[PDB]
Amino acid sequence: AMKITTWNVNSLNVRLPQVQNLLADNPPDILVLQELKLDQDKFPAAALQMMGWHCVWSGQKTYNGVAIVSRSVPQDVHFGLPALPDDPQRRVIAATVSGVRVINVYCVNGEALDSPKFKYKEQWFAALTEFVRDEMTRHGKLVLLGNFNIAPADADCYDPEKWHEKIHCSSVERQWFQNLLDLGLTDSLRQVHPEGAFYTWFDYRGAMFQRKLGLRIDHILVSPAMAAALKDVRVDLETRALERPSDHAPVTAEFDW
DNA sequence: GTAGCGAAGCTA
Ligand SMILES: [Mn+2]
Ligand SMILES: [Mn+2]
Numbered sequence: 001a002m003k004i005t006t007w008n009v010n011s012l013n014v015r016l017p018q019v020q021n022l023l024a025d026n027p028p029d030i031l032v033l034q035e036l037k038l039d040q041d042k043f044p045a046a047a048l049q050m051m052g053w054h055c056v057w058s059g060q061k062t063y064n065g066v067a068i069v070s071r072s073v074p075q076d077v078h079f080g081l082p083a084l085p086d087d088p089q090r091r092v093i094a095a096t097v098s099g100v101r102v103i104n105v106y107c108v109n110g111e112a113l114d115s116p117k118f119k120y121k122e123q124w125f126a127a128l129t130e131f132v133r134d135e136m137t138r139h140g141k142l143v144l145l146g147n148f149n150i151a152p153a154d155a156d157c158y159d160p161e162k163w164h165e166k167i168h169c170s171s172v173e174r175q176w177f178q179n180l181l182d183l184g185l186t187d188s189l190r191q192v193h194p195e196g197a198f199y200t201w202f203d204y205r206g207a208m209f210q211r212k213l214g215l216r217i218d219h220i221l222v223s224p225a226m227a228a229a230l231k232d233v234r235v236d237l238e239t240r241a242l243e244r245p246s247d248h249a250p251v252t253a254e255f256d257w
Numbered sequence: 258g259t260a261g262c263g264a265a266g267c268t269a
Contacts, residue, residue: 010269011261037261062262109269204259247260247269
C-alpha cells in the first residue's frame with residue numbers, strides 16, 4: 001500500500017499549518033508540494049523533521065519552488081531538467097522513495113498564448129518530456145505529478161467555449177500533455193473516474209470555488225506498473241474550503257500491490 | 258477583480 005498526495009500550496013510559509021494537518025490526519029506515504037515561494041535556506045525543515053518526515057526541496061525567492069516529503073528517505077535526488085540546464089526557475093525535483101521514482105513538477109503556467117512565457121512553456125515541456133522518457137528507462141514504478149497548468153479536455157474546464165484556445169486549455173497545450181501520456185503514462189484520475197468534473201484549481205477572484213467553477217490542472221501520471229496497482233484518486237476539496245486557502249486543491253492517489 | 262510577495266509590480 002502507498003498513498004501519494006500532490007498539492008500546489010502557493011506559499012509554504014502561509015500554508016504550513018495546513019500542510020501539517022494533511023500530514024497528521026490520514027497522512028500519505030509521500031507528499032509533494034509546488035509553488036513554495038521561499039528560498040532554499042527558508043524551508044521549514046525543522047518543523048517537518050520534528051514530525052518524522054524527510055524533506056528534499058528546491059527553492060528560490062518569491063516564485064516557483066518544489067519539495068518532496070516522505071516517511072522513507074528520498075534517494076538519488078535530481079534537480080531540474082538536463083535539457084534545460086541554465087533555467088534558474090526551480091520547477092522540477094525527482095527522487096526515488098520506496099522503489100517509486102517520484103518526479104515533482106511545477107510546470108510553466110504560460111500566462112497567455114501570445115506571451116513570451118508561452119514559448120518558455122513550450123520549450124520547458126519539451127525538456128520535461130525528454131527527461132521523463134529517460135527516467136522511465138530505469139524505473140518501472142514512476143509517478144510524474146504536480147501542477148501541469150494544462151486542463152487535458154473539455155470536461156476539465158468549467159466553460160469550454162469561453163476558454164476556447166485560451167491558456168491551460170489550448171489544443172497546443174493539450175498536445176504537450178498528450179506527449180507526456182505517449183511515453184507510457186496514465187492519467188490516474190481519469191482511469192478511476194472517466195467521467196465527471198474534478199476541478200483542482202479555482203480562481204481566488206469572483207468566488208469561483210463557491211461557484212465550483214474551476215479547471216483540472218493538477219494531475220498524477222503513472223507508469224504501467226503503477227496503473228495496474230491503482231486503487232483510487234481523490235481531490236481534497238475540504239482543504240480548498242478552509243479559511244485563507246490555496247487556490248489549488250490537494251490530489252491524492254492510492255495504490256495497493 | 259484576489260492572493261502572496263515585497264515594498265511597486267510581477268506572477269498566477
Ligand atoms: Mn472547445
Ligand atoms: Mn499563484
